[PDB]
Structure formats: structure tokens, C-alpha cells
Amino acid sequence: DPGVCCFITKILCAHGGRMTLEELLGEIRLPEAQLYELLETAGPDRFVLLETTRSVVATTRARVCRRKYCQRPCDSLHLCKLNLLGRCHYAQSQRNLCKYSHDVLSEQNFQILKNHELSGLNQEELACLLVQSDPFFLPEICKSYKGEGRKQTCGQPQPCERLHICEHFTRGNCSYLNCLRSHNLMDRKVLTIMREHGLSPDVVQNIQDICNNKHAR
Ligand SMILES: [Zn+2]
Ligand SMILES: [Zn+2]
Ligand SMILES: [Zn+2]
Ligand SMILES: [Zn+2]
Numbered sequence: 001d002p003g004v005c006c007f008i009t010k011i012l013c014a015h016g017g018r019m020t021l022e023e024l025l026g027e028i029r030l031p032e033a034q035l036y037e038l039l040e041t042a043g044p045d046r047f048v049l050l051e052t053t054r055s056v057v058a059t060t061r062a063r064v065c066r067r068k069y070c071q072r073p074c075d076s077l078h079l080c081k082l083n084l085l086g087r088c089h090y091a092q093s094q095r096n097l098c099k100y101s102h103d104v105l106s107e108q109n110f111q112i113l114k115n116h117e118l119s120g121l122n123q124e125e126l127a128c129l130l131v132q133s134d135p136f137f138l139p140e141i142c143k144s145y146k147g148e149g150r151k152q153t154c155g156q157p158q159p160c161e162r163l164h165i166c167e168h169f170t171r172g173n174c175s176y177l178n179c180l181r182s183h184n185l186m187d188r189k190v191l192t193i194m195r196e197h198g199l200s201p202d203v204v205q206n207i208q209d210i211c212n213n214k215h216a217r
Helices: 007-014 021-028 032-042 107-115 123-131 188-197 201-215
Strands: 018-020 047-051 054-058
Touching: 007 018, 007 021, 007 032, 007 054, 007 123, 018 021, 021 032, 021 054, 032 047, 047 201, 054 201, 188 201
Parallel strands: none
Antiparallel strands: 018 054, 047 054
């Protein structure tokens, strides 16, 4: 019923979603070329390789459902976003119930996880993977932001609290060679907003590197 529990995915997700190639090699006990074969077969939509001496950042094409009022059939995951970010009160309150599933390993999600080679991961491992992969988990992007070096139509009378970043870049589909909108998630103001939303700079760095990878398509 479940798919195969993937050694490489398992190890990366247990180690925070990124490891150096040298670390992974030590864990898997293979010659470098044998590991590269495994990584290349899964492809860049699952394992991002970069120079950091190289590292591997785990990702997935699995995404959380974006429908307002979903009914079957659906090919996406159904779960509580805020919960995976440690930001859902219902994880503490006994008053009423969250409308979103707080169990990523639900019957409903089972087949989707299998379709994406994610069987045999626990909720902590899945959350690590998803939060650095699905743009759904990012803070809102400012639609008033048109690009760098422009008098912004936002920010008055009160400061803008939305990210001044390219939304398409975060979704892996910015088609500009020289985009006018920032692709720099590691900017200090961005990191503050990410942090408040529940994303640490280390998580954002992984997101940055995954998005850089997709932009280089
Ligand atoms: Zn759905
Ligand atoms: Zn919830
Ligand atoms: Zn703004
Ligand atoms: Zn862009």
C-alpha cells in the first residue's frame, strides 16, 4: 500500500532539510558517484544540489490544497498550515475544533504522500519538507510592490507588513532574467517578517536555495 520509504529523503528531513554531501555520504556509506546517481534520478524537484564543497537541500512537488471549498477529487494535501508552523491555537485550546486537519498522515493524504514518494515519513519530517517547499507557508507578498528603485504606493500612513519580494520567484515561475522585483529572501527586513510568521533564517535559506535552483531552469 505505502510506497517505498526513501533513505535519502528520510535522512535529509531528520537533519533539518539540508546536509552537506560529505555528511550524506557518511550516512549512506556509498562512493560519491553512486550517491550522485540516486540524487540525479530523483531530480532537482526533489533534491537540490548546490555549492555552499556541496550540499543537498530536500524538496518535493507535493503541495497543500489551495481551494477555498474543496470537494473530491483533489490531488493536494489537506492540513492545517498554521499548525505545521506552530501557530494554530487549536493545538492548545479544547474549545471547538480547527477546520483543517492537524494530522498530516490522514487517510485523505495517504495516496498523495505515496504519489510523491513520501511514505514512511513522520509528521515532523513532513513538516520540515513542506515548510521549505510549498510557498503556501510564506507570509503574504505585497501586491503594491512593483520593483526596486521605485516610490512605493504602500507604507503610508503605516508601514507595509507584506514581503517586498517577487511572488513568481517564490513559486518557481519568474521568467525574468533581470527581474525588477527582489529575489533576495535573506534581506534583513524579509527575515523579520519570515520569523514572525514562524520561519527561521535557516529555513528561509533553504527556500532561497530551492527557489534559486528553480529560477536557473
Ligand atoms: Zn483539496
Ligand atoms: Zn489548525
Ligand atoms: Zn508593500
Ligand atoms: Zn522575479
